[PDB]
Every structure is written in C-alpha cells, then in structure tokens.
Design a binder for this molecule. Structure first.
Ligand SMILES: *[C@@H]1O[C@H](CO[C@@H]2O[C@@H](C)[C@@H](O)[C@@H](O)[C@@H]2O)[C@@H](O)[C@H](O)[C@H]1NC(C)=O
Ligand SMILES: *[C@@H]1O[C@H](CO[C@@H]2O[C@@H](C)[C@@H](O)[C@@H](O)[C@@H]2O)[C@@H](O)[C@H](O)[C@H]1NC(C)=O
Ligand SMILES: *[C@@H]1O[C@H](CO[C@@H]2O[C@@H](C)[C@@H](O)[C@@H](O)[C@@H]2O)[C@@H](O)[C@H](O)[C@H]1NC(C)=O
Lengths: 170, 319, 170, 319, 170, 319
C-alpha cells in the first residue's frame, strides 16, 4: 500500500529492493534483480575483506613458573595489556562504523530506484511523496513492466495525462 | 493505478550496533568473533605436542630410570607441561637453567639420541658407578644418559665430544657436590677438584661446592645438573680431576623459528588437528577475532574482550 | 530571507534544524523539534561510544636505575615508542574521519527537511532553489503550520494555484 | 508568501579539523583528550602509596636503626621512590638483587613482621653481636631484623624457618666478608666457612669473600645482603659454620597481580584519591586519551602526542 | 551526447566536473572551475593528512647472536609479530575505506552540479534523466553561459517555453 | 538545444581497491607505501656508522696490536657488525658481557681515549710484561690499552682511577687464569690471589680460576676480559695481590638516548646520508609505510606486508 518512506515490506520475498504495483488486472511485488544482485556482490566483498584480510602471524605465549626472573615478567604482562587495549577498542569502533555505512548504503540504493523511476514518469504521474507514484494514465501490465525495465515512453502517454491534469484543475 | 518503490523486511531477530543507534534490527548479519573451543589439546598442523605424562622434561632428558617409556619422539609442535610430575631428579640436586632449556625444547624437528663417548675406553678410573637413589629394578642404578666417573686418584682424565652435524647437539651433565673433604678424598683422591669445558678458546671451570646439606633420600651430598647446546661442526674437550658426572648420550635436534611453546592444560592429548590451540581447547580460526583465551599457540584470531561482534549485511528490519 | 543553501541562521535559537516563514500576518523562525531531537540522540550516542568504549587495563610503568641490565631496557624503550606511534596516528585520523561524517550527517538531515516539504507542495509552490519556496496561493498561519506538521493538503489549494500559473504565463 | 528550510548558526568560536578541511567553525564540539593534572601524588582507589621518607626500601626492611618510625604499613598501592635517601646500609656492603626486590614489593596487601627463630635457644655461639657503624642511641647496635652470630669455634649451627601461611614470606639475611684470615679465625674459629640454605632438595652454599677493601666508616670488611621469598607451607633449613648474619624477623605478604609500581616524583604524598597517577600529578580519567605523561600507574587514558582532539558535535557555523 | 549517468567523458580535458552543451552555433565541453578547484583542495588535504600525520619515533632493532639469553629473545620476537599484525591489518582496511569515501565524494559532487542546474531551469527544460536537459526554448551562447554562471533567468524564457509545452500536448 | 552535466575520464591505467569493489579504474591515484631502497649503508642524519673493518669491537677497545688503524672516531650513529672479523682476542680467553657492551657502544657522541694511571710510578712490581701471542712487529707485545703486572712476591699493590668528567668513563681490564699453582707462584709469588674493585661502598672480589685448558696458540692458561662504566665524578680503588691485567687507558663517552644500533649487512659504508636505514639499503621516508625490511634504524615508515597501497585521488575512469 505505502512505499519505502513508511518502512519495508514483509511481502517481497525474492530480493532486497523492488516494486509494488497496483492496476485493474491486479497487484503484486517484484524485486529488482539487477540492483539487488549488485548490492549483494558489494556487501559480500566488504565482509570478505574484513574477514580474509586478517591473516595473522604464528604466535605463542607463556604462562610461566617464575618469581624468579621478574623484570621480563612485568614487561611481558604490560605488553599483553597493551595489545588487548588496542584490538578491543579499535575493533569495537570498526564494527560500529562499518555497520553505519552498510545501512547508509542500503538507503542510498533504494532512493536511487525511486529517482530512476521518477525521472521516467515526470509529470505523467504524481509523486505522492511516500515512495508511491499515482499515474495520470491507465497502466496495463506491459506499461508497469516498461517502467521496471527502464523502457517506459514518456511521449506515448503524454496526451491522456494532460487532460486528467486539467480535470483535477476543474 | 500506482507503482511503489520499497524494500525487504523479514522474520529475522538479529540486531546490531552502530555509531548512531543501539540494537537496530536487521534482515541479516554475520558474527566475526569466534567464541567456542573444542575442549581438547590437539596436534598443530598435524604435528602433535610432546606428552611426557608422569615425567619431567629434565627427568626425561637425563634418562631417569623411571622415564623409560615414551618412544623416541622424533619431533613435536609444543610441550604439554605437568606441574606435579613425580619422576624428576632421582639423585637430589639443582637444575641449572631450566627455563632456557624449556624454551629451547619448546618446538623441535629431528630429535635423535646419540652416543658421545665410550667409558670402557678409559683407563685408571672406574665408570658406571651406581646409587640406590636411582634404582632400576629394585637394584641400584643411575641415569641412562649420564656416566658417573670415580676413582682417579687425583689424576686428570679426558673426553672429546663432537658435533659433526649441520644441526645443534644438546648435552646434559652433572657436578657432584660432596658432603665433606673425607668423601672428596674417598671418591676422587684429593681435597678439591676441577672440571673444565673447552669450546675452542672459550672455557668454563667447574669446582664442587663441598659441605653437608639436609639429608634427603639418605644423602647429604648433591648433584648440580647442567645443560648446553653444542653448535654444528664443533668440538668440546673436557678435562677433569674429579666430581664430573659425564655426558654419555646427547641429542641432535633442529629448532623451528616461530617456535612451538609451553601449554599448561588439564585436558588430555587428542587425535584431532588444529591451527590454533588454547588451554581451554582448539579454535576454528577462519574468523578474525576470538574471545576464548589470551594465551594461544599458532595461527590465531586476535583476542578481544567483546561478548560478540555483529556485522550488518542486511537492511533495517522495520516491517 | 534565504535558506540553507546560503548558510545558517543566527535567528533560530531553539534547535538545530527548522523553518523560516513569510506571510501577511508576519514572519518568524521555528525549529523542527522531532528532526532535531532525533539527531541529538544520535550524536550523543556516537560521542558516548567513542568515550565510554575506552575502558583500559591496569598498567604501570618503570623509569629505572639501570645501566645494569640493558637488553630489557632497550626492549622496553622500543615498546613504548611502538605504542605511542600506534595511538597517536590512529586517533588523529579517527578524529579527522569522524568529524567529516558528523558534518555530512547534518547536511543529509537538512536536505531531508527540504525534500519532505517539497514533496507536499509539488507545483503549488515554486522551488526558488535557495532553500525557499514561493507559494502560488495565499498562506495563513494554519497553512504554514500544516506544512510544518506534514499535513498540508495538495488538493485544497490546487485551483487558486493554477490560475496564478497561467497569469505568470501572461 | 514564502517558507524556507534552514539551520542553526551561533556565537561559538570553536573550530575542528576534518579529512577535507582545516579549522572548520562549528556550533559545538567536545574535547576527548585530557590535558591537565592535579599536581599531587595521591592514593590509588583509596589505597595510599608507600612513603619511606628518608629511608631506603632496603634500609627499612633490614631494620636499620635509623628507620625506626613509619608504622607497620599493612598495605600500599605503589612506592614513592627517593633517589638520595640517607638511611640505607649502615654496615657497608652490597645488596644483591635490588631491582627484583623492588618489583616484588611494588604493590602488596597484608604485610606483617614475624619472628623466625630465637637466638637465645642457641648453644655454643654468641648472638646479638653489635657494631659502632650501626648505632642505636650513641651506643653501638645492629639491624633490628637481622642477628649477627659469632664465636662458634668452627663448629656448625642451625636454624629452621617456617612459612605456615598460604601466602609468601619475605626473608633478608647477610654474609660477612672478612678482611683477612686473621679476623676469620678470631670471629668464627677457622680459615674458611660455609653456609647452606636448604629448600627441600634445592640448596645454596654461600662462602665468604675474604680480603681487605677500602676503609669506609672505619671498616675494611663488608657484608653482602640477600633476600628471598619463602613460598606457602614451606621450610628452609640453614646450616652454617660461620659468617652468617642470620634472619631473625621476616614479613608475610600478598602481592596484587596488576601490581602497583615505582614512582619517581618530586611532589609530596596527598590525602586525595585517583584512578590514574603520573609523576606530574593525578588525572580525571573519564576521557579516552591524555597527553600529560607517558609513565602512568593505574587505569589510564592512552598517551598521545596531540595538543588537543576536538570532536565536532554541532553544525558548520557559517552565519 | 549523454551525461554522467552513462559514464564520464574522454573529451573534457581541463578539470574534473563540467558541462556539455548543444546549440545552433555549435557544441563543446567546459569544466566548472569553481567546483573542480574546491574538490582538489579537499582531496589534497585528505592525502596530505594521511601522509604527513605519520611522524614516527626513532626506533632501532636487533638481529642478535644469542642462543644465550632466550626469554628476552622470545619476547622481542612476539612483539615484532604483534606490531606487524596491527599495522598490516589496520592500514589495509584504512586504504579500503578511504578509497570508498573518495569515490562517493566525487559522485556527490557531480550530482550537486546537476541539482544546481535543474533548480534554475525548472519547467523551462525537460529532465531527460540521463544527466541532460532538453530546453523548451532556444538557447544561444549567452543563455548557456548564464546557466554555467548560475545567473539564468527563469522568467525571461517562461513564455516561449509554455507554448512549446502545449504543442507537445497536441 | 541541450546542456549536460558530466565528469572527466582519462587514459590512466591505475586501478584501486575499495570496501565494495576490487580493482576499480581511476583517473589518478597515489602510492603511500615505499618499496625501494638504495642498496647502500649510509650515515644517519649526517653522522656516519662505526666501521671496524677487520677488527672486533672487543679487539678494538682492548687495543689489540692488529687494530692499530682507524682514527679516533670521536662519534658514530650505529655500528656495522662483522660476524667473522679475524682480529679479536690475541691472548686466548673469555669476554664477559659482550652483548651489554655492544648495546652501550651502539651510538655515542664524544669519544676520547684517556690515560688512567702510570705503571712507572709503581714499586716492587714489574709492569708492561709481554707475550708472543700478542705480537707487535714480529716482536712479542701486548694490548695497547691494558698493562700486565707481575712479580709482586705475594704483596698487595694499588691503583685509583678517576672520572672527573660529567660523562661516563669506559674501562676494560683482565684477570689472568693460570694453568697450575706452579705458574701462580712463579708470576705472582703465592698459591692464590685476590683483586678487589672498590666503588665507594660497593666492591667486587675477583679470584683466578686455576687449571689447564686445551693448548691454544701455545697457551694452556687464559685471560678473562671485563668491562665496566665509571660514572661522572667518581673513583675506583683497586687493590690486588696478583693476576690483575690492569686498565691503563679508558674512554670518556656520551650515549645518545634513542640510541643508534647494530646492523648486520653485507653492503659497504657510503658517503650518502639518510633518515632511515635497513640491512638492504636506505629509505626515502616521506611516505608513511614501507615493505622493504622489518629491521630498521632511525625515523622510519612502518613496516607492512602489503605489495602496494594505492589511495584513489581521481574519479571512476569509465569512459
Ligand atoms: C626431519 O623431519 C622432517 C619431517 O619428517 C617427517 O615428519 C616427521 C613427524 C616424521 O614422521 C618423519 O619420519 C617424516 O619424514 C623431514 O622433512 C626431514 O627429512 C628431517 N630432516 C633431517 C635433517 O633429519
Ligand atoms: C588483607 O587486607 C585486606 C584489606 O584490608 C583492609 O584494608 C587495609 C588497607 C586495612 O585498613 C585493613 O585493616 C582492612 O581490613 C582484607 O580484605 C583481608 O582480610 C586481609 N587478608 C589477610 C589474609 O590478612
Ligand atoms: C661532542 O660532540 C658534539 C658534536 O660534535 C661535532 O660533530 C662531530 C661529529 C665532530 O666533527 C666534532 O668535532 C664537532 O664539533 C659537540 O656539539 C659537543 O661540543 C661535544 N661535547 C663534548 C662534551 O665534548
């Protein structure tokens, strides 16, 4: 019924981003495969880089028997704390920041869909401002499909639309 | 007639944290922090640990009569350490530089016992002397790898050991610290003695520390136990006029650089293999961080004090 | 007089983001409480995470009396430099990056206000392109308030607006 | 009739730095770098430091006659170190392993002096011998915690010390290094002596280093000062035939793991309390970084070399 | 022929961002100097901060002769690995993240040009949606130059444009 | 009539990596990882390294007769180390604490040889004794900086050295370890000897380790070589009754804190200067990271294991 502005859709189960359409023949959800797939490639790349790039050195540690030499003890103990502080703090914040970006990425992606559609329709539709478009002409399945394929023709529905505009004005 | 632009929402209950919000529900996410072990001590890239069971490392290398079991482990990736292992030094004394010896033997590759001299070549001296405190089979004996030499009437005797290999040679020996001068003269035929290790130009002179200690295992004298590593193509010449418990057997070995280690663990050795080992068990280390244990051996995720680290992969799950 | 495009307003003293309105009854500034409050919650979260997440280990350091053992001296001295380089460089850049984002966050927030308003008005107003809208109908206080509440009704002013458009065209 | 979308601007003069610009004016920002101390040495989480004033740590533990002041500090969170404290070793000599002893005593919890033996149980020996170089009240004396034993006619004598506690026991003692054989025979009745510490099987034999040093405080002989820690439920047996200045009093103690420390500071001790302490003063450590001092003790913001770190919180302040 | 939506232009050789124009007198490319210059100042700042802020301590290292003291050996060797892991992993990801932002920065900058132009033209042009505008009036060089200078006057071409709109409608 | 908004594309073939994509073509980018040296050992901020050529550091400081060449290097920024340098200890023996001595001499500032006493002031003793094993010009000689003292008939002799400077004073000396008592009495006129170093109250007693080692260079006796640093305004008093090879010349010096270092390199010294030096060559260190070598000396980019690090500066290059 409403678009991305009011939230996401339980109904759409075949991808991340897509459309909901309304006409005389009926209604239904359809994921935009191309835009979804592109985002998936990218997120996988990000996650894999964060995981695969940690390729760490062969280490080994000592929990000794040792009120014997001390000065080295104390140095080893200070070093373990230092490393601990470094990884804990940095990687906490890393997750916080990377998560922020991921969510922004998805928001940016969805708005792009809306902007791409809007640019095709122009004044043949009315931007309801909730992520939906009210078309000023009748729209069969092939019309809807043309919009989803990015092949909708502005000129071909211009005339039917203009009459409807002036009817609104009267 | 309408068309709307929208996004997925879902039944997934995972949440994640971000700079700007706490616990934001998402359609999908990924744990990048490993948080469970397998509760076993494993071999490490298919090389198993050294398991001395009831022996100490010192007991084993000296050739304590009670250690006469584990097979010649030709190699090992680290050492399982026992804190109270009964079979250690049978003749009471001190071990000099244990911590460095443990570090040296922490991970090693080819490890073969080798004979360093014949006592029955020697003249004007008694060899293979024996004591009750190191018993073989109810009968008194002595360390397998050391030879106790006596009765030289204050006269000097000699031993060249060689390392002809391109790898190091591990040596153990002892100096007998006698209880008084009376016993010093009885065994070695003089009031005072000297033992000298010659490594080309370098030298070391050991003299015994005479006097009576506490009686332990019927003894008021002691032995001081020493070790050394003899480098590739190298010779030492030993001259002594007494109190030397000599090195009869040694070990060729090769140390691995990112060297194995020492593990104190309650867990028993297992058939399993891993890339990363902790005192708590082993780790699936394909993840970049872990919170199981700070003390690890191998190729390990970094230790952090987080309880989890969720990476968002999906979208804000607001239906 | 002008909108966000030409800068920020000395005049608005009750919040971060808001409106300036112009009509017959008068003029005045009004902060958008909801959008301001939301941003404040978020910035506070960011700052608090950067501060509170640094919960560091009990350390202690040694400035010794010691041309005595050296090898450990030198190792301890190398370690102190190493740690110093790490924290200095990383946290310098951390502040630089986080500051960048914060400012972007505020820019994104303001544009959203403009986009939310624009979507309500459509062609009942003319986007002057400086962050202001010229309305094509007369707008009393209740009209202005409807826009600020997001309840402005497009249909109800459509007719008065269309005449004014054609007057422009003549 | 118009309506405009705009944002706050302000009288605030703070600027901040970013990836893309230098010194961008903002309506509000936050310092995340602590940059001032309080110029005092404080107690640490309510546990105060150890303040030896004019005594050395060695002087104090030995029981120098000049240290007879500070109360039995049952505990302390770190040590204020004095570089030139007059009251140190009254009888001239060497102290063996001071740096490890300072590390051991750096932060400790329960600390109680304890008697280790009675000298007046002993036979065929003189105890409590005294010297001018360690004076009590114009009259010659000796360390409170050590007992100087003499006149045994070359015959052996003994002392068992026990630690019956589940905590360590700190021991100090000395070996008298005599100026020539003449004095060796005078005091202890022989040319040469031995002293042996027995810790079960482990042992240590001290022999004195005879010969004349420089005259200092009217003395050409010296004492070598030793310390050791005796573990829970543990016993040592000491036998000596001379030159032993014996351990009469010791201290039970408990070390804290993230152990206190050693502070060289000009500042005096204060009533105040803090979580983080530096030689320059204490720190309000609720901030994540600091630039005051690299050498800190406690729970401290990380040290960085920045002059400030401004986080923007407000908006670009372009009126 | 086409705008940023379909990619970048080989032809424009005097800056980063700009215009391609089409009229009766001819055609040509022109970089927007002001917007380019601003972005260059900024990128240089970023790069310089990443480089200049690394001002590191005097270090020195030891490759010893030493199956002599070991415990310190092993500690020194563990420390070198630790440092190595830290710098390698962090600076790998640093480059990955910073590169991401840089590219976003350029995308944001270009869209801004488009939005700034669009706001001047309004309905005197038709947004073709490929980064180009079809003007509804004839546009000489001075017209084009006014748009590039941000001084194009909406009112002055309104009438010629409206006729052309209704012609489309017939 | 149209107008389009667009962006630059280019002939540039550089690609870069990002979070979301691999190898994205750009119109311009910048390497921030230094990846090449200059294949020379250079001076460091215009201070050159120490180049001992065929001598060892020990050989040089002792004043081996074969080291009589390099000029009094008043200063140096680090040491080029040779692993097999022929000219080391001419009279066979042990060097005590070499690694600490190398660390002490690793980078130093003012370095001037200084005389510590006159042997020809001394009475009832022979000085300047000489041996074939340290030859000058076919004729037997001895170390330039040490004086071998003999023939004191078991009687004591003395030497005060002073450091009147506000900087440290480096000292080297030796103890003669004789082959048997027969030679002990021949040279020094007694069975056993003592040598005592007095640093105010602190003292050290050296006694020789008598006995026959392996014959090397016609000798079965040895010398043990010692070093020490004497602090500003300070005095030591040495008394010996034999076996002392005394310190005739020393060196005032000043150590730099972020101290120089030790470089093992095959490369030869060069006229060139740098801020950062590796065993592989020097580095243009205006870049923040490098992948040339882990072991560096100076002001150096951090070492990382990347093969390159491209920062994008330009735009996505999609024509
Ligand atoms: C030393 O050992 C290396 C590995 O040996 C192999 O694995 C061990 C665990 C044994 O099962 C052994 O029998 C295997 O051959 C060898 O690659 C290498 O040849 C050996 N090197 C020397 C110098 O002995
Ligand atoms: C040791 O001390 C712990 C802390 O003791 C308390 O604080 C100190 C500073 C004193 O004022 C003391 O009197 C206080 O009771 C105790 O919690 C603990 O009982 C003690 N433990 C032992 C084994 O003595
Ligand atoms: C020690 O040396 C410092 C640097 O000396 C200068 O550079 C060296 C390499 C020589 O060429 C030398 O002749 C130059 O003067 C001096 O700044 C300083 O005066 C000296 N200090 C002392 C206490 O001698």
């Amino acid at each position: 019924i409403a678009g991305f502005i009011e939230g996401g859709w339980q109904g759409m189960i075949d991808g991340w981003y897509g459309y909901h359409h309304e006409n005389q023949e009926g209604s239904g959800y359809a994921a935009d495969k191309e835009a979804t797939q592109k985002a998936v490639d990218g997120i996988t790349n990000k996650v894999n880089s964060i995981i695969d790039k940690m390729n760490s050195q062969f280490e080994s540690n000592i929990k000794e028997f040792n009120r014997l030499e001390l000065r080295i003890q104390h140095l080893s103990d200070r070093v373990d704390d230092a490393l601990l502080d470094i990884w804990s703090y940095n990687t906490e914040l890393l997750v916080l920041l990377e998560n922020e970006r991921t969510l922004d990425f998805h928001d940016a992606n969805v708005k792009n869909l809306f902007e791409k559609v809007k640019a095709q329709l122009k004044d043949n539709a009315i931007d309801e401002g909730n992520g939906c478009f009210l078309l000023l002409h009748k729209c069969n399945n092939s019309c809807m499909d043309d919009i989803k394929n990015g092949t909708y023709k502005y000129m071909d529905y211009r005339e039917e639309s203009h009459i409807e505009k002036q009817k609104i004005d009267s | 007639d309408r068309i709307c632009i929208g996004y997925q929402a879902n039944q997934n209950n995972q949440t994640v944290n971000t700079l700007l919000e706490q616990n934001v529900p998402v359609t999908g996410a990924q744990e990048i922090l490993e948080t469970n072990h397998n509760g076993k001590l494993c071999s490490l890239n298919g090389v198993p640990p050294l398991d001395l069971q009831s022996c100490t490392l010192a007991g084993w290398l000296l050739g304590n009569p009670n250690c006469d079991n584990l097979l010649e482990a030709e190699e090992w990736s680290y050492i399982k350490i026992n804190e109270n292992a009964p079979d250690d030094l049978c003749f009471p004394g001190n071990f000099e530089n244990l911590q460095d010896l443990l570090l040296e033997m922490s991970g090693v590759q080819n490890f073969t016992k080798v004979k360093l001299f014949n006592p029955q070549s020697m003249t004007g001296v008694t060899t293979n002397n024996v004591d009750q405190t190191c018993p073989f089979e109810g009968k008194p004996s002595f360390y397998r790898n050391l030879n106790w030499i006596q009765g030289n009437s204050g006269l000097p005797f000699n031993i060249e050991i060689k390392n002809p290999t391109s790898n190091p040679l591990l040596l153990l020996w002892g100096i007998h610290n006698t209880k008084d001068a009376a016993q010093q003269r009885n065994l070695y035929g003089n009031d005072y003695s000297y033992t000298i290790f010659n490594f080309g130009e370098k030298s070391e002179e050991f003299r015994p520390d005479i006097g009576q200690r506490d009686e332990i295992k019927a003894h008021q004298d002691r032995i001081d136990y020493y070790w050394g590593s003899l480098p590739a193509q190298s010779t030492l010449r030993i001259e002594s006029t007494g109190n030397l418990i000599a090195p009869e057997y040694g070990f060729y070995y090769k140390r691995k650089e990112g060297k194995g280690g020492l593990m104190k663990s309650k867990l028993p050795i297992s058939d399993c293999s891993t890339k990363c080992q902790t005192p708590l068990g082993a780790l699936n280390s394909t993840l970049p961080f872990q919170n199981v244990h700070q003390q690890t051996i191998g190729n390990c995720p970094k230790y952090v004090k987080a309880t989890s680290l969720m990476l968002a992969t999906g979208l804000r799950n607001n239906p």
